[PDB]
Amino acid sequence: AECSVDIQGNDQMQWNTNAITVDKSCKQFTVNLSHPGNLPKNVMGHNFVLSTAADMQGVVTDGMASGLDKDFLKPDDSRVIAQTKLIGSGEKDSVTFDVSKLKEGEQFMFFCTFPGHSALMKGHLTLK
Amino acid sequence: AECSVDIQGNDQMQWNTNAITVDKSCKQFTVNLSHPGNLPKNVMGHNFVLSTAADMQGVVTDGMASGLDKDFLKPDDSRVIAQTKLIGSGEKDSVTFDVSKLKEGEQFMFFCTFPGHSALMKGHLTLK
Numbered sequence: 494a495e496c497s498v499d500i501q502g503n504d505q506m507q508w509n510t511n512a513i514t515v516d517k518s519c520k521q522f523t524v525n526l527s528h529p530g531n532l533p534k535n536v537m538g539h540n541f542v543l544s545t546a547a548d549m550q551g552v553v554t555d556g557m558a559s560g561l562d563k564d565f566l567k568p569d570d571s572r573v574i575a576q577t578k579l580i581g582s583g584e585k586d587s588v589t590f591d592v593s594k595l596k597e598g599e600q601f602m603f604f605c606t607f608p609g610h611s612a613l614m615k616g617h618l619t620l621k
Numbered sequence: 622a623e624c625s626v627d628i629q630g631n632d633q634m635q636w637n638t639n640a641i642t643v644d645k646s647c648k649q650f651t652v653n654l655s656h657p658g659n660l661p662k663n664v665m666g667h668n669f670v671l672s673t674a675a676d677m678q679g680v681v682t683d684g685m686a687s688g689l690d691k692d693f694l695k696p697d698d699s700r701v702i703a704q705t706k707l708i709g710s711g712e713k714d715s716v717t718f719d720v721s722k723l724k725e726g727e728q729f730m731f732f733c734t735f736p737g738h739s740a741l742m743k744g745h746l747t748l749k
């Protein structure tokens with residue numbers, strides 16, 4: 494039944510969870526990102542970005558180059574399975590993706606592409 | 622069900638693969654580690670160490686303190702699911718573990734604890 498997870502990125506560059514498990518029952522999966530901090534998007538913006546483990550470094554690197562006004566994401570980046578907006582304190586964004594995009598046998602990571610954030614704001618997504 | 626994997630750690634501190642999928646059909650799984658490089662253990666020693674993604678930091682940190690002569694691993698580290706010994710150029714070691722030690726929705730990482738290597742020699746393992 495459970496095909497969504499609520500995730501928080503705070504003023505300390507921490508996710509409240511570093512592991513998400515997608516039930517193979519789920520045709521679609523929803524990530525509800527919120528920012529419970531006080532700092533604005535230009536200081537402590539967070540996004541939720543999902544890719545293969547192998548692709549994460551390249552997504553982080555090319556996102557950095559794209560800058561704040563592009564949510565630190567390379568536009569139309571085919572390595573990105575799912576992304577939210579970059580959000581600041583008190584904001585929220587959701588993303589729904591087809592679980593068909595998660596291939597059995599792949600390793601997945603989620604991360605924030607705000608420059609410097611992905612060192613601490615990284616987690617692993619798996620299927621149960 | 623292939624219930625083993627051949628893994629190489631080389632002189633450029635690369636795994637030949639950064640992703641292992643263990644077939645849920647496997648009661649046991651075997652890692653065959655080789656060092657195809659020419660650098661000896663004291664400069665380019667590799668081990669294969671498997672833990673949860675959560676435990677990897679602690680295992681790597683506690684491993685430093687043990688030094689070369691204890692394979693840069695905390696003795697009897699309950700967080701280590703599987704380990705090989707530390708090997709140098711043209712050496713081999715194998716480890717067999719029970720797949721019951723893995724859980725279907727949990728994230729596992731394999732890494733080398735030779736200080737500095739785990740930045741470049743970190744891979745992801747999941748139960749498929």
Ligand SMILES: [Cu+2]
Binds near residue numbers: 506537540
């Ligand atoms: Cu962030």
Ligand SMILES: [Cu+2]
Binds near residue numbers: 630634666667735742
């Ligand atoms: Cu090594």
